[PDB]
Design a protein around this ligand. Structure first.
Ligand SMILES: C[C@@H]1O[C@@H](O[C@H]2[C@H](O[C@H]3[C@H](O)[C@@H](O)[C@@H](O)O[C@@H]3CO)O[C@H](CO)[C@H](O)[C@@H]2O)[C@@H](O)[C@H](O)[C@@H]1O
Ligand SMILES: C[C@@H]1O[C@@H](O[C@H]2[C@H](O[C@H]3[C@H](O)[C@@H](O)[C@@H](O)O[C@@H]3CO)O[C@H](CO)[C@H](O)[C@@H]2O)[C@@H](O)[C@H](O)[C@@H]1O
Lengths: 309, 309
């Protein structure tokens, strides 16, 4: 009784960042999710500040890789032997699904591989794509592959970084049918089982749906599905981690306030395990004031009936 | 008297992010600064949470641009007519030096320009470089130019984004003599005066130097100087903005603690206007435990003598 008061940050949606790719939030979206399994590994944190899945604290590290590269002779493809984010040896023994910040969806992520030669500080950068559905995508084992626009310029045994930019669609897939944001990679490669996953989430209360914090990933070629939904803004992960306020019940009731009127636009349930539901049926793009924000009002239970959104 | 207690986050250096480019912090550095003018515009915030210069809250937006592009016929260069970060019309009337997150140094920043055609969701991405020392670099007026690897693929009148990756050195400059991280761009173009700048900072107390939060920018070609020093981690900007605790004096005394020994490694002054000094003379790369962190201990004055670092 009397525990440290819980709160959420006073940040608007547009002031916040996607927790699944290093891009700003744009909007709030709700829709039915019974046809997919919602089990992202980035953007996962309890309200009392326990990080889950592959979640880490800074959004700039999400979907980045570091290590050194080995050329696949006769191609423009390179295997990256992963390092830790601070360039130390990779330690696969941590009880996590994959290195923190590893992509948590199946898709073709395009970006740039950069490299510095230690002895003389010479540098180079080339377009690179990682397909996280590849049979050899195995970040948990310390290995990922990149397709590039070169077969000669990258040196072995030198620090190399991948910076993500966006996603592509190619190879005869149907328009907007890749990436597949709710399909988890096999982090140790094809036909191995993932471990230490953050659990799937779903609305269980009748008339409720998940509320998603949505961005549009940049597209770099083709006709990709650029929608990217996270369960928590990255800033909420950062805040809960720092505050570590105890949950007094299973659900924190939040009101979304419009400062231009002083009135509540909608209310929602922030579940203590780190996701949000609203009372709505159907797909809906929320129309919010750009200065709107969430405010924690009270601890309720999972059996609380929300005002329809 | 009795005002809201000030604090700094319990985050390690490696858990934090540079406030001047979207990359993690790596290390702490101190050195003399009397030969340059230290006046960065990103990573500027008072301890009571007032953002300064071109500083905004999420690190992923730093050095990004959005707008639409016009081809310079006969070249592979494009002029970008800037939009707001949320794709609204750019409003140049704000009392800021340039759009929030604009690069605050002179250099050649390489990244990728991405574009989506609205009608059909077709996408494209191409290597692009912005030279922030260019006479026509004029983000305050809503205009910047990009050199690309194409002369045909980008459409006019469609949303286009630049995602930064790293820096280059070329054009016969001396090795490691560009970028120039302490040279501010002319935000309205060559021979116009910058406005609404965050002030330059310098140590004034005898025997003191600035303490810099340092990263290494990826290099994409040539022999660039990749050192990038910020005055405050991005997370400290975010924290002070959120906490808005009043400064009880001009200086917050911080101790850097080593959890592996329980002892203080060094102490420093966090000036209320948002920068840090230490008692040291000379260039020094600080050797810190990776789990070390800063802790606010007391309000002192500018005339407090620190223990030598
Ligand atoms: C949609 C385009 O994507 C990039 O061009 C890619 C090219 O797309 C073509 C489609 O495959 C085709 O169905 C039809 O719609 O024309 C498109 C180009 O005219 O596909 C190839 C592989 O087939 C590559 O992936 C190209 O990058 C982009 O550069 C174009 O401007 C379009 O946005
Ligand atoms: C340092 C290299 O940078 C990229 O190559 C660039 C190339 O650099 C050359 C230097 O200019 C030259 O002094 C000497 O050191 O050889 C270098 C390449 O062998 O310079 C051109 C323009 O002159 C381009 O900027 C190249 O990108 C990189 O691709 C190389 O691997 C080196 O890191």
């Amino acid at each position: 009784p009397g525990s440290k008061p819980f709160s959420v940050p006073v940040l608007t949606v547009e002031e916040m960042t996607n927790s699944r790719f290093p891009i700003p939030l744009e909007k709030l979206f709700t829709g039915p999710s019974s046809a997919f399994v919602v089990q992202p590994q980035n953007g996962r944190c309890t309200t009392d500040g326990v990080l889950l899945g592959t979640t880490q604290l800074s959004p700039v590290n999400i979907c980045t890789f570091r290590g050194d590269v080995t050329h696949i002779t006769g191609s423009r493809n390179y295997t990256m032997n992963l390092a830790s984010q601070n360039w130390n040896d990779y330690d696969p023994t941590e009880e996590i699904p994959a290195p923190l910040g590893t992509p948590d969806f199946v898709g073709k992520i395009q970006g740039v591989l950069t490299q510095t030669t230690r002895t003389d500080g010479s540098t180079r950068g080339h377009k690179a794509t990682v397909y996280t559905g590849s049979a050899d995508f195995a970040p948990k084992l310390g290995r990922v592959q990149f397709e590039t626009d070169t077969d000669r310029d990258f040196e072995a045994n030198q620090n190399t970084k991948f910076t993500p930019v966006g996603v592509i669609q190619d190879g005869g897939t149907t328009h907007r049918n890749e990436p597949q944001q709710w399909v988890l990679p096999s982090y140790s490669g094809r036909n191995t089982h993932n471990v230490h996953l953050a659990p799937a989430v779903a609305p269980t209360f009748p008339g409720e749906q998940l509320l998603f914090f949505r961005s549009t990933m940049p597209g770099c070629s083709g006709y990709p599905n650029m929608d990217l939904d996270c369960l928590l803004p990255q800033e909420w992960v950062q805040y809960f981690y720092q505050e570590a306020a105890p949950a007094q019940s299973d659900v924190a009731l939040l009101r979304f306030v419009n400062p231009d009127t002083g009135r509540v636009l909608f209310e929602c349930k922030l579940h203590k395990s780190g996701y949000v539901t609203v009372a709505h049926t159907g797909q809906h793009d929320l129309v919010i004031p750009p200065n709107g924000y969430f405010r924690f009002d009270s601890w309720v239970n999972q059996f609380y009936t929300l005002a329809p959104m």
